[PDB]
Amino acid sequence: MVLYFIGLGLYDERDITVKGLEIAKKCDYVFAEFYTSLMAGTTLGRIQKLIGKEIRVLSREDVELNFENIVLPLAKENDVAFLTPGDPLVATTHAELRIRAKRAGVESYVIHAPSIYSAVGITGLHIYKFGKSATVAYPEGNWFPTSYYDVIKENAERGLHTLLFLDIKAEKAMYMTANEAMELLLKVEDMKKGGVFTDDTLVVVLARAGSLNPTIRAGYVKDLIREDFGDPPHILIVPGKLHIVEAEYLVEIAGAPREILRVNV
Amino acid sequence: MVLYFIGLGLYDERDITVKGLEIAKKCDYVFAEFYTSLMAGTTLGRIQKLIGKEIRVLSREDVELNFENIVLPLAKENDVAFLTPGDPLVATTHAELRIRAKRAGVESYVIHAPSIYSAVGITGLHIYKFGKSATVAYPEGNWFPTSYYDVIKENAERGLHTLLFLDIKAEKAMYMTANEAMELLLKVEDMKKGGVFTDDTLVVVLARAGSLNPTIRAGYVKDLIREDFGDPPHILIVPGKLHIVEAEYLVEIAGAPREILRVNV
Ligand SMILES: Nc1ncnc2c1ncn2[C@@H]1O[C@H](CSCC[C@H](N)C(=O)O)[C@@H](O)[C@H]1O
To answer: Where is S-adenosyl-L-methionine annotated to bind (chains A, B)?
Structure first.
């Protein structure tokens, strides 16, 4: 009669909370989805070994089209867990799954875990200064989406930071790198000429948040566009004007050039 | 010979990540602060029991003025952990403590935990639609903070949601309720008269996120301003223009007036 939405956290199998682990261990059935994102620092086998339960993976179609006939039926007479990378319901489509549960007469509870949304606090950028977020999508065929560029423009003009999620082909385990994202933004800039993203733009790259050894780098596009930030996943941030404390953290912790203390504050 | 900043999560001792627990258990010294937020579902005793170590609680003064005299000295010859509610670097100034660690020759690591900043996803509002955040602070003497009002205005004009952290005076055991925040906002409205926050404004309240049964309520200020949302901590959200699915969730899960389903596109 109960369905638990449980977050797996940021990077590996230990990023789930103690609460989520203990609840998952007591569930009769455990499902999981790895299409909204992946857990790059672990494997399905390691997660399964930690929880001590067989884990049934669901595709985007299984969930979006058949959640009510795959998961809910079992939840009607058993304790069922639905694991998701990060924090449950951060992904935009997951919230409605609670409505499906309600419709089916199934109780649902959410067990939170760290999300990249809050983990960006490790960049030293003040969380309250982040504005609207966006996702950088790979262009394809005759389609060249650029809404993420407009998001940066609108945030930056108001002195806010912009968190940019990078494209991912979960099923193929293919990640867009911060380097590719910078190249794309420069390309969009050459097209719109809004003066939003250039070689002189200060950016921050956060790779493998959640790991004990994440890569945190800050600097100008001209210098970082060909830098190796390590293995995925990568997150790109275009900060707005910086509070001196933010700049000092970027210099001392993220290796940013001293120049940001006079140019970006 | 290391310093760990470890988050404890949203509500109780089990909101810590498995990673954070296993590391904290092996540290030589464990310090913590409980003034940046309120963990309403646990006690120092229960946390100490889970980690199996004595926890030295520090005051805001101990940290801000003497972190390098109380904590860092030990981290030079031992493994030390500094625990905090939620995520250690979200809506705190703890990021700067990493600079103090460096300058003192101490390597530091960050272990994330569930944060209210991303937990608001449970309200059904799209996380990417949240704009700049703000804090509603208690007026003191002749000083009456009002900056949070302008934040709501700025976000709303862009169709973005506004997350409002509520004030906390840990030493006085005072935790601002969503009710007190709404009252303060109505007073600022009468002053600036910008039509930003009125009795007809739709708001969302999330209380005790992290618990299994948090209070999630949506409705007009005139109806919610005197409603009992249970014990603290509370967070207040002022949504911007709603997507249909957001409205459906607010109605189905947060008990909002069904009239909001009729979005004015
Ligand atoms: N479990 C919870 N439920 C509702 N609001 C919460 C909360 N935890 C924190 N808050 C909100 O955030 C304020 C403290 S701000 C510090 C936040 C913390 N670092 C984190 O990551 O969550 C509180 O006064 C309250 O308004």
So the answer is: 10, 87, 90, 115-116, 166, 209, 234
Residue found by looking up tokens 């120049």 in the block: A259
| 3-state class (DSSP) for residue A232 | coil
How many other CB atoms sit within 10 Å of the CB of residue A230? Answer: 15
Query: In the 8-state DSSP scheme, what is residue A170?
Result: G
B127:A133 CB<8 A: yes
CB–CB contact A19 B12 (8 Å): yes
Return the residue whose CA atom lies nearest to atom 12 of ligand 1: B165
In this structure, what token pair is assigned to residue B176?
Answer: 């601002």
Q: Which of B12, B15, B17, B242 to mutate to test the interface with A (most CBs of A within 10 A)?
A: B17
Cα A172 from chain centroid (whole Å)? 17
Taking residue A257's Cβ as centre, other Cβ atoms within 10 Å add up to 15
Question: Measured at the alpha carbon of residue B238, what is the angle toward residues B236 and B240, in degrees to the nearest 5?
Answer: 155
Contacts (Cβ under 8 Å, ≥6 apart) of B65? none
How far is the C-alpha of B174 from the C-alpha of B193, rounded, in Å? 29
Strands (E), chain A: 2-7, 29-33, 56-58, 79-84, 107-111, 134-136, 162-166, 168-169, 174-175, 202-207, 215-220, 234-238
Say if B1-114 and B115-265 have the same CATH topology.
no
The answer to whether the Cβ–Cβ distance between B18 and A17 falls below 8 Å is yes
Question: What single DSSP character describes residue A167?
Answer: P
Alpha carbons B124 and B213: distance in angstroms, whole number: 15
Structural element, H or E, at residue B80: strand B79-84
Burial group, residue A168, by CB count within 10 angstroms (0-12, 13-18, 19+): buried
10 Å Cβ neighbour count for B78?
13
Q: Alpha carbon A3 to chain centroid distance? A: 24
Angle between the N-to-C axes of helices A96-103 and A60-70, in degrees from 0 to 180, rounded to the nearest 10: 20
Cβ atoms within 10 A of the Cβ of B144, count? 13
Q: What is the 3-state secondary structure (H, E, C) of B120-157?
A: HHHHCCCHHHECCCEEECCCECCECCCHHHHHHHHHHH
Cα(A178)–Cα(A176) distance, integer angstroms: 7
Structural domain B115-265, CATH architecture: 2-Layer Sandwich (3.30)
A234 annotated ligand binder: yes
Q: How far is CA B12 from CA B17, B89, B232, B234, in A?
A: 12, 18, 13, 15
Structure tokens at B149: 């009002």
Considering the domain delimited by A1-114, tell me its CATH architecture. Answer: 3-Layer(aba) Sandwich (3.40)
> Cβ(A20)–Cβ(A111) under 8 Å?
yes
Residue length of chain B: 265
Quote the tokens at residue A122: 């490790």
Segments making up each domain of chain B, as ranges: 1-114, 115-265
Contact B119, B37 (CB under 8 A): no
Answer yes or no: are the C-beta atoms of A59 and A5 closer than 8 Å. Answer: no
